[PDB]
Ligand binder design. Structure first.
Ligand SMILES: Nc1ncnc2c1ncn2[C@@H]1O[C@H](COP(=O)(O)OP(=O)(O)OP(=O)(O)O)[C@@H](O)[C@H]1O
Lengths: 463, 463
DNA sequence: CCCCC
């Protein structure tokens, strides 16, 4: 009995509705997996696949009440969760899945085995996914204008290519990249090109994810990054002028983890999967509230140094020290990019870069030598080291150099340490930094009298 | 009559739905005591159980309306409230429960009597639960490298072993474990190994729980210790910097209490049971403003004295004092531990350590000596003893020494006390301790008079 | 329920 129960069982036997570990209901319609808590996806699937059931079952599914009964039966039948979005080298489209390691495009049940629950939102066109075209030469000219193929720009260009290509691989990336440069240098053009290329896998959020508390309450600004392969933030302010909050290192470290806590309004799903490449456009370098060794492992910088100016302001730009090259501005390029002219050309370029930079494992490495905020830590980290045991047979040398021994621990006088620091970094130049380092790296032998359990590398080098 | 009432009664006879003190229901589907406030779990269980009922009842449960009526009956029958997680010698694994006292593993229905809602998160395998393993040998070698098996490095090893074994205890512990050391001392890799070994029973929280109010408003960090056998803290804010908040001895005592304060968001069930031992990882000595016998009974310290470094910097690493023994670092160890390679060997190691520590009671013990902050408290407790009239039979000796009889009590002037202490503990080297003593125990009987209501142990011993 | 506070 229960024709409706039989219909629900038949639909469940097709493996077209699945329950995820988070609590979602993903359905397979029109050659793609979709989930949406606001749309009647299960009844949509029932109506869509009414054609694959017997003729006596097809006519029963034209009634919304009966479709809702079938949906209730299916919901009670789904008891086990599944693992979704586990292939980091598959790019999902609206009509199939592209193999990023092989170049094969799968449609239908071939693409169904990879439970890719997101998509670009548009259809793959193999007649445009071609190497040579009128659009490809123009796109290559644009890219070579933005990032010149010169010898002094080799490393920066390769880093730019790697960062752009990493927006295809759906895994957790462990760095935050900063597109730094002066005005009119191509950063927004690059952003728009990437958005056109990867479609719905691209999202843009606010600086609140960098300068606010992520726990909070309902946070759609974080909940909108679930499974996105690229996240953009833009327009960092100048932190030198007091009045702007600094970037939270806690947020920076929390954004590189495989899961991020944040939930929408009227929703109970708090944890989102992190597959994102986070890129920040800025005219100014970042300043963080607190600097430590971990934070320095998650920051990378790509610099833009080509100006596109109108003919009136070309001469003033040619004498600027923030530009290496000046080019003529193009006034139709924005519209051409907006109309998705270079979508498949840039997609092909990104796939080629993915192949080139995906030597067995692809990983993003930090560039801490570019951020001025990290210079004080980087310099002093190679000059002073903790107490020494194998250098214990040098206590006479330490005493002659000014150090003292206390429980076989090297201690330096505060005044002597200040005088030594003044040589490498002037007091007038970095008094706040030197005083903070003295107060932070030193232990308190008393309320007033204290000592630093850190000796200079050069002092120990002296025999 | 009321066939649906009969069905509900028969389902209730199987003890598959229970009502917990938190207000929610727990159901037994697919061999797991699972609960949800968002899923139709009771109707799912009804549809699954329908096979066990008679034939005339089985065809009744194919209608969602009938299942809803049966659910209404079943949840109107549930009047008595029960409790979960009542057994401390059991480990819940994804497909059963392992017994600590008996060394037996029960699968399927045999795990039903144990109302365990949380689990480690990996299937229990008997074949890999063996001693003849190539993995346990390398694991023991790595553990020996991190903690040398020597007389000088024995107390630290014992404390480390007890802290690791505490995660298998299903009870409340009053001690908080601390990891102290230098860079690459094994703390992070030990944390990774423990996370791999215990699966979902490990949570990581920032520094908010330590440097903020534990209750405050919403405290997800505090609430995450709810049935979390291990709590981790990383990148602690060293106290040498001036202008940072402090960890509270009141918070330490609250964590030592058998139910720590903590609630989830939009919730009132703050009475969350505590089976947690907190592991705090840092690199600098903590500073506590108020230090006393109560705080000294709830503070544990474990110090690392090893370092692995590159061969180019191997001699420089061996030079340092923070490394008792210096070895050569292996870069693949990170991936090896992140891949959960030695999970069964580590689990058997912890089980064997628990068997060695199988005393009816297994309680953690503070190690206040290691922390440099508690040295002053040890000196004060061993030297500063309250003195007053109850030992009146020393008046002649006090007059001979130079003291006075204030109602036949033992007291010394503040200036005299400072002059006497100047020989033992330097005033410049004990300024904070002297100020605290003067503010606390320097009791006087007059506004202008200066006296202290205590005498040194030497003054007590010598008449 | 969010927002508001
Ligand atoms: N290769 C190119 N050749 C000619 N014109 C270009 C080229 N790339 C970009 N342009 C144009 O020159 C200007 C460059 O400004 P664009 O918005 O790209 O960068 P930006 O000012 O650095 O960005 P942001 O919005 O982050 O400040 C735009 O008007 C753009 O259309």
């Amino acid at each position: 009995g229960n024709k409706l129960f039989n219909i629900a069982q038949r639909i469940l036997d097709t493996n077209s509705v699945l329950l995820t570990e988070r609590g979602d209901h993903i359905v397979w319609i029109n050659n793609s997996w979709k989930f949406n808590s606001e749309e009647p996806l299960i009844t949509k699937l029932i109506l869509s696949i009414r054609h694959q059931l017997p003729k006596e079952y097809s006519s029963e599914l034209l009634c919304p009440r009966k479709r809702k009964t079938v949906e209730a039966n299916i919901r009670d039948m789904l008891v086990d969760s599944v693992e979704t979005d586990t292939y980091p080298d598959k790019l999902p489209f609206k009509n199939g899945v592209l193999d990023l390691v092989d170049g094969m495009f799968y449609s239908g049940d071939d693409a169904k085995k990879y439970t890719c629950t997101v998509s670009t939102g548009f259809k793959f066109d193999d007649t445009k996914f071609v190497e040579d075209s009128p659009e490809m030469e123009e796109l290559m000219n644009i890219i070579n204008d933005i990032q010149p193929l010169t010898d002094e720009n080799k490393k920066n260009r390769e880093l730019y290519e790697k960062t752009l290509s990493s927006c295809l691989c759906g895994a957790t990336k462990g760095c935050l990249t900063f597109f730094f440069g002066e005005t009119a240098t191509g950063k927004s053009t690059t952003k728009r090109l990437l958005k056109s290329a990867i479609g719905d896998l691209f999202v843009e959020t606010g600086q609140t994810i960098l300068t606010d508390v992520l726990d909070k309450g309902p946070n759609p600004f974080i909940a909108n990054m679930h499974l996105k392969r690229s996240v953009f933030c833009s327009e960092l302010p100048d932190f030198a002028c007091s009045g702007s909050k600094k970037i939270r290192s806690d947020n920076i470290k929390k954004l590189t983890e495989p899961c991020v806590i944040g939930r929408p309004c009227f929703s109970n799903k708090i944890n989102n999967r992190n597959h994102a490449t986070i890129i920040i456009d800025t005219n100014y370098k970042p300043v963080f509230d607190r600097i430590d060794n971990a934070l320095m492992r998650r920051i990378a910088v790509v610099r833009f140094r080509t100006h596109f100016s109108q003919p009136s302001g070309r001469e003033a730009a040619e004498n600027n020290d923030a530009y290496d090259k000046v080019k003529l501005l193009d006034e139709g390029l924005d519209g051409k990019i907006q109309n998705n002219r270079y979508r498949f050309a840039f997609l092909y370029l990104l796939v080629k870069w993915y192949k080139k930079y995906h030597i067995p494992i692809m990983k993003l490495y930090p560039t801490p030598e570019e951020i001025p905020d990290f210079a004080f830590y980087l310099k002093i980290g190679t000059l002073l080291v903790s107490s020494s045991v194998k250098h214990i047979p040098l206590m006479t040398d330490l005493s002659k150099k000014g150090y003292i021994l206390y429980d076989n621990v090297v201690t330096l006088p505060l005044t002597t340490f200040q005088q030594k620091i003044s040589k490498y970094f002037n007091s007038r130049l970095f008094g706040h930094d030197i005083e903070s380092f003295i107060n932070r790296h030193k232990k308190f032998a008393n309320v007033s009298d204290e000592y630093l359990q850190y000796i200079f590398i050069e002092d120990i080098s002296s025999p």
